[PDB]
Amino acid sequence: LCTHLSYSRSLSPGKAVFFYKTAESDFVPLRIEVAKISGQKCGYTEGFDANLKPKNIERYELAYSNPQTIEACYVPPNVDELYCRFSLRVEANSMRPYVCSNPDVLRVMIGLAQAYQRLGGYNELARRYSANVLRGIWLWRNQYTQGTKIEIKTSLGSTYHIPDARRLSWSGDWPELEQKQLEQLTSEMAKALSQPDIFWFADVTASLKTGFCQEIFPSQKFTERPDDHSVASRQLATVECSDGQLAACINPQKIGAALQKIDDWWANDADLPLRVHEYGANHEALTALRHPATGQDFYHLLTKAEQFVTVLESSEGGGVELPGEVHYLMAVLVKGGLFQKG
Amino acid sequence: LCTHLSYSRSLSPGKAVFFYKTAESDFVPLRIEVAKISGQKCGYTEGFDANLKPKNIERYELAYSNPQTIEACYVPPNVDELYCRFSLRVEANSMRPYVCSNPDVLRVMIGLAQAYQRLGGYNELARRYSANVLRGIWLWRNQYTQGTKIEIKTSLGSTYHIPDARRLSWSGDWPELEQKQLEQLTSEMAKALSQPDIFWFADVTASLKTGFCQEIFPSQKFTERPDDHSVASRQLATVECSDGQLAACINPQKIGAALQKIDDWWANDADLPLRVHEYGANHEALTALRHPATGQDFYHLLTKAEQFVTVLESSEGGGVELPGEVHYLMAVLVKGGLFQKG
Amino acid sequence: DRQLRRYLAPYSAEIGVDGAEKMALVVLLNLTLKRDRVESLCDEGLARQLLSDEGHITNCLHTVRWLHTHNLKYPDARVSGERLIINAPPLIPGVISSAGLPMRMGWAHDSSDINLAKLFGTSFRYRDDSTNLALQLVARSKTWEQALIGLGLTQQQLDIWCQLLASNLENNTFPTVVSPFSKQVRFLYQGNYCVVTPVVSHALLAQLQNVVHEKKLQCTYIHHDHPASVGSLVGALGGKVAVLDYPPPVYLHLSGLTVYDASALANPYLCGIPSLSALAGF
DNA sequence: TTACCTC
DNA sequence: CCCAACTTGGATGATTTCTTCCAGTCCTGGTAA
């Protein structure tokens, strides 16, 4: 390796905002409210000490409530559907290092990206990214609707339409006249990812049909423990509109974390995909699948490039020859960052 | 050389400010926001030591997040286009040393500038500066829009208009009715650089057509590593309006760093140009292309001025016969500084 | 080594010379020359040569006539008249004064005797007490006389000097008249008025210069122009003299009084709250 | 009427 | 009036700290031959 090496971020959304329409005004923001509640005194250490004698608590002392201050968000009465919208840009920006201090490293990283491009493989990554947009997984915990409709309009003049996204799986075969749109979208994106000087934009709007006063789940703020007994313990993220009103939103990197969730190349058993990570982090189980001790992480693999180019170059292409190790590496270069001080 | 020798800065901008219009008010500033995020534990030395056994880290220990504090900036919902503006002044100020302690050095520096002016040459420098204004490369990382429109007005009554600047190259032939405006602008500036007592001003505005909530990239401040965990690690540069509002901007020397990027006279192979520098510093590769060991730097070249004047004086001129070494030297004198202690 | 000159200075602790009387006479005689002419204070030859010069020694013997215990010129070199030699007053339990200190003398006459005065007026510890060369010779101290004759002095020259040296310390110990440039202040004493003239104690001031630097006390420095014209100690200190600095932490009823330019130097030893003798006066 | 000296 | 006020997992990685030449006076002492 070498002292300096960096790549930039080649795929990115802006933020998502919730709103609804009225008969007289086309854009009304969804907003949040704040309130004080009476909670429970419960859970471990409420009544225990290192699981020994359960302290010296009198029977009546746990019948008391525990008050708290929280923020919450609900759809108002008589609104039949809620809209959510965001924009997405894609750039062919993994073809070249943002910074590299070593001409011998540089010629190889370039040779590899090109060796890969012409054998196919950007189609593979594009298919995986495209599937995640049309499935709707970027709504996170708000997927539970009575019906979800997704529409996309790109800068090249195409239109895509999924009449109901509630049941499209990661693994399976999509119903006819939807499979068709996954193929077309893949082609626009596969190009955008590898050919330079194309200015490609997507504009994604989804509609949520909801319950009478359904609760909505926007991004939370990261805060420290409060000590004024007045400020809300849980706080939600909003944006300011041109006229000064506030609206609920989902943060950029939270939308992005969902879109890039395409990694099932480990252990020769696909299961469910992980968010691409140099160490294979798994947040649900609090562990790591590509721990350095296994030889399966990014940094071990980064040093084999000379051997990968040799294989990719010797193959004919357009076949089934691309291994999991090459695909993984390309996915990491797409989510660019700092690979330095070797 | 001698103990005192200085030139002043002959070409300079003020600063660039981002704003947008409303139906009721013409100047509304774009402003910045601050927020907490949850990051990744990743990269070398997170899990390694001299590339050997990756320490004694338990598998679960890398699945933890790494929080950070950043400032950021986004265009608010429903604004159709963003404006950016700055002013530029140019002075005929490379004809004479600001300070010189040696009468024999002085008569030579004067002789040279004049020998150069009358053979042609300021036209060449003016063309190169002019091309960079019209292209729009001073927007740095904000060039990726759905359309870029550039408009210029000057103190002599001229107006220039590039309806769409997104595709004009450093090297190539510009489309018709744009090539023409480059020629006209070159003429005004060639005079501004060479004749005294012309008070020449330009006022440059551009418009950016953007995405729904596209991110904007203003200048950053230079800071030291904090340890209070309360101050942002990434801080952005703003200005204060006369009414107290703040706005995002680009620093004067960051606009200037782009405009003066006209140096492809090294190694007899033009490639891409460098920012004019006495040692040819290359910021992307972390190196220097006119290292003193090559004989190609400013200081070696400055000592041959007596010989260059002789050639210029004997030559006919009016053609393309001037050597790279003479053009380089004049470019450095335009970005004046301190050239002493021989 | 310059440290030898430091330890023989009036502002340093006194050092013992018991069993070293021979080199003590050599060093002390050698100090009578300008520093630029002497490569060492330890050269026996130079001392034997200086000792044979009756004129040089005569000029040195003459300085004895103005040795004093209290210095009437200290604050102001213009004061003219006689020296003052007085034993320290009885100790008062509530007052810091020279009463608790041993006997010491200094020198201050025409400002050209800085070097020549050092032969007889320089003190040292001997037989475990405080003395100087003039006292040991006047008292007929045989050990010093035997070393001095051994260094080349004729018995007849010593027999004459013992007399002239003693004579210079036998009179003019109290001034005849009050000098015109001295201070005079008057108060009631035993039912009537008396005029008081203060004077600075040599022994007391010299000790203070050492204590404030060793015990780390709060202090400042007072400058004197032409140090040679004020005295032995002021010259040795280069015209800079240390004093204590202790400022405050800030029926007929008089309210709101303002004073401009009050004297903040209560006595030559102490800066701080103005002298209480002045308020009683008021 | 002249000069002689303190870290 | 009256009763309560919350457990947890976590707080960064890279390399650089400049230069030229200057630093004003004058009036303000006792003592001896």
Q: Where are the beta strands (DSSP E) in chain A?
A: 5-6, 11-13, 16-20, 28-29, 33-39, 66-72, 81-90, 99-100, 148-153, 159-162, 200-209, 238-240, 246-250, 281-282, 287-288
The conformation of residue A145, written as its DSSP 8-state character, comes to S
Half-sphere exposure of B150 (CA within 13 A, CB side): 23
Encoded tokens for B172: 């190539």
Partners of residue A86 on adjacent β-strands: A204
Question: Distance between CA atoms of B168 and B181, rounded to whole angstroms?
Answer: 13
Residue C118 in tokens = 């050092």
- Chains A and C touch each other (3 or more Cβ pairs < 8 A): no
Distance CA B30, CA B218 (A): 11
Distances (CA, A) of C258 to A244, C254, C261, C275: 62, 11, 10, 17
CA distance A130 to A149: 16
Question: Distance, in angstroms, between B184 CA and closest chain A CA?
Answer: 29
Q: Which of B20, B38, B42, B167 to mutate to test the interface with A (most CBs of A within 10 A)?
A: B42
The amino acid present at C110, given as its one-letter code, is D
Q: Which residues of A touch B34 (CB under 8 A)?
A: none
| The three-state (H, E, C) secondary structure of C13-79, written as one string | CCCECCCCHHHHHHHHHHCCCCHHHCCCCCCHHHHHHHHCCHHHHHHHHHHHHHEECEECCCCCCCC
Closest chain A residue to B80 measured between Cα atoms? A242
DSSP state of B294: G
Q: Which residues on chain A are in Cβ contact (under 8 Å) with B38?
A: 222
Closest CA to B201 of B335, B7, B12, B332: B12
Resolution (A): 4.0
* Sequence-ordered list of residues with C-beta below 8 angstroms from that of A160, at least 6 positions apart, any chain: A134, A150, A151, A152, A153, A181, A184, A185
| A72 CB-contact burial (10 Å; exposed 0-12 / middle 13-18 / buried 19+) | middle
Find, in chain A, the residue whose alpha carbon is nearest to that of B39: A253
Report the structure determination method. Answer: cryo-EM
Q: In sequence order, what are the beta bridge partners of C169?
A: none
- Please tell me the number of Cα atoms within 13 Å of C204 on its side-chain side: 20
Nearest one of B295, B296, B298, B325 to B309, comparing CA atoms: B325
Helix (H/G/I), strand (E/B), else coil: A301:
helix
CA distance B194 to A209: 69
User: From chain B, which residues contact A within 8 Å (Cβ)?
Assistant: 22, 35-38, 40, 42-45, 47-48, 51, 54, 59-60, 62-63, 67, 74, 76-79, 144-146, 166-167, 211-215, 284-286
CA distance B242 to B238: 13
CA distance A323 to A335: 20
The closest of A211, A77, A153 to B211, measured between CA atoms, is A153
The DSSP secondary-structure symbol of A323 reads -
- Compute the half-sphere exposure of residue B322: CA atoms within 13 Å on the CB side of its CA: 26
Interface contact flag, B47 A4, Cβ < 8 Å = no
DSSP 8-state code for residue C85: -
Among C100, C79, C75, C103, CA closest to C234: C75
- What whole-number distance in Å separates Cα of residue C113 and Cα of residue B231? 72
Vertex A233 angle, CA A231 and A234, to 5°: 120
Neighbours of A179 (CB within 10 A): 10
C1' of E28 to CA of C13 (Å): 38
B68: left (phi over 0), alpha (psi -120 to 50) or beta: beta
Report the residue of B40, B44, B168 to disrupt the A interface, i.e. the one with the largest count of A CBs within 10 Å. Answer: B44
Can you tell me the distance from the alpha carbon of A243 to that of B318, in angstroms, rounded to the nearest whole number? 60
Provide the token pair at A239: 């944006």
Rg of chain C's alpha carbons, rounded to an integer? 22
Give the single-character DSSP code of A338. Answer: B
Nearest to B62 among A103, A223, A281 (CB): A281
Q: Is the CB of C236 under 7 A from strand D?
A: yes
**CA dist., res. A292 & res. A307, Å (int):** 20
Give break positions in chain B: residue before each, C–N beyond 2.5 Å. none
CA-nearest of A334, A279, A329, A280 to A303 is: A329
d(CA C66, CA C117): 10
Measured CA distances, B227 to A103, B35, B230 (Å) = 36, 17, 8
User: DSSP assignment, residue A9?
Assistant: B
Q: What is the DSSP letter of A332?
A: H
> Residues of C100-111 as b/e, b for ≥16 C-beta within 10 angstroms?
eeeebbbbbbee
Query: What is the distance between the alpha carbons of residues B245 and B19, in angstroms, rounded to a whole number?
Result: 12
3-state secondary structure of B238: strand
